[PDB]
C-alpha cells in the first residue's frame, strides 16, 4: 500500500507525538514529521515543496514548532492516542491521490499533498496558501 | 490535446456535420461519431460501455439516426461553419476530465465521458448509453 518513505513519514508523525508527549494525533504531527530532520535531502524539510515552490520553509517550520509547543504535555501513556478521523482522512486522501496519480504505492509526496490539502495554519502568527500546484510541480520533478 | 483515438472520433464528428451538410457540429454528430462502423474494439460502439451497461447499441444507433434526420438543413454552401459553442463546452469538459485524471492527452474514453455529461435523448426511459456512473464503472476498466 505504502512506500517505505511514506511509512517513514507517517511513522515519524506518530512517534514524534509520543516523544513530544502529545494526545490525539493532529495534522500538526504529520507536519512535525515533515520537519523531523535537518537533512536537506528530506523533501518534507528543506528541498521542499514549500521552499522550492512558493513559501519559506521557515514559515512552515515555525508553524509547526509553535504548534508543537502549544500542545500541552501529556502522560506518556496517551502520547499518540490515535490518528482519529484526522490522520485517517490524510492517509485515505493519500490513497485517493494514488488513484489520481496512477501510483501503485503511497508516496511521501501523497502524504505531503494530502496533509497540505487538508491543513491550514491554526493561528494568526503564520500564514501561507496551500499552493497545490507548486507543491505538485516540485514533487513531480523529484525521484521519478 | 487529444490523442489519435479521440481525434478519430472528433474528426468523424466534424466529418459527419459535413456528411449532413450542416453549418455546425452538434452533439448528435458526435454521438454519430461514436457509432460509425461495426469494428468491435470501438469502445464508443461495440465492445462498449453500453452493452456492459445492459443497453442495445443498435437501438441507440436508431435513436441517433432518428435525431440525425431531424437536422434542419442539408444545404451545401452553408455547411461547415463552426464546431459550435455546444461542443466548445464538451471539449472544454474533456479538458477538465484530463485534469481530474492527470492525463496528458484526451483519449476516446475521455471524449466519450465529456459528451455523455452533455448528452441526452429526449426520452424518459432512455435507451441512451448507460448513465455516467456505469460509464465510469466500465470506463475505469480501461488503461488506469
Short mmCIF file of N, CA and C in Angstrom, two decimals, chain A residues 97-103 110 136 140, chain B residues 97-104 143-144:
data_model
loop_
_atom_site.label_atom_id
_atom_site.label_comp_id
_atom_site.label_asym_id
_atom_site.label_seq_id
_atom_site.Cartn_x
_atom_site.Cartn_y
_atom_site.Cartn_z
N UNK A 97 -5.16 10.14 -3.88
CA UNK A 97 -4.12 10.71 -4.68
C UNK A 97 -3.47 9.61 -5.49
N UNK A 98 -3.19 8.45 -4.90
CA UNK A 98 -2.61 7.37 -5.70
C UNK A 98 -3.48 7.09 -6.90
N UNK A 99 -4.80 7.08 -6.69
CA UNK A 99 -5.72 6.75 -7.76
C UNK A 99 -5.65 7.80 -8.86
N UNK A 100 -5.58 9.07 -8.46
CA UNK A 100 -5.47 10.18 -9.39
C UNK A 100 -4.14 10.19 -10.13
N UNK A 101 -3.09 9.80 -9.41
CA UNK A 101 -1.73 9.81 -9.91
C UNK A 101 -1.35 8.50 -10.59
N UNK A 102 -2.17 7.46 -10.43
CA UNK A 102 -1.94 6.14 -11.01
C UNK A 102 -0.66 5.52 -10.43
N UNK A 103 -0.43 5.79 -9.14
CA UNK A 103 0.72 5.32 -8.38
C UNK A 103 0.43 4.07 -7.56
N UNK A 110 2.44 12.02 -1.45
CA UNK A 110 0.99 11.94 -1.41
C UNK A 110 0.60 12.36 -0.01
N UNK A 136 2.81 20.27 -6.23
CA UNK A 136 2.82 19.17 -7.17
C UNK A 136 3.99 19.30 -8.12
N UNK A 140 6.75 16.37 -8.56
CA UNK A 140 6.89 15.67 -9.83
C UNK A 140 8.29 15.71 -10.39
N UNK B 97 -11.66 16.86 -17.50
CA UNK B 97 -11.52 15.48 -17.10
C UNK B 97 -10.04 15.13 -17.10
N UNK B 98 -9.29 15.66 -18.06
CA UNK B 98 -7.88 15.35 -18.12
C UNK B 98 -7.21 15.81 -16.86
N UNK B 99 -7.67 16.95 -16.34
CA UNK B 99 -7.09 17.47 -15.13
C UNK B 99 -7.45 16.54 -13.98
N UNK B 100 -8.70 16.09 -13.96
CA UNK B 100 -9.19 15.20 -12.92
C UNK B 100 -8.43 13.88 -12.88
N UNK B 101 -8.01 13.41 -14.05
CA UNK B 101 -7.29 12.16 -14.20
C UNK B 101 -5.76 12.26 -14.31
N UNK B 102 -5.19 13.47 -14.28
CA UNK B 102 -3.75 13.68 -14.51
C UNK B 102 -3.31 13.15 -15.89
N UNK B 103 -4.18 13.25 -16.89
CA UNK B 103 -3.89 12.74 -18.22
C UNK B 103 -3.37 13.76 -19.24
N UNK B 104 -2.20 13.46 -19.79
CA UNK B 104 -1.52 14.30 -20.78
C UNK B 104 -2.21 14.37 -22.15
N UNK B 143 -7.16 1.30 -19.50
CA UNK B 143 -5.93 1.98 -19.11
C UNK B 143 -5.78 1.95 -17.58
N UNK B 144 -5.76 3.10 -16.92
CA UNK B 144 -5.58 3.14 -15.48
C UNK B 144 -5.01 4.47 -15.02
#
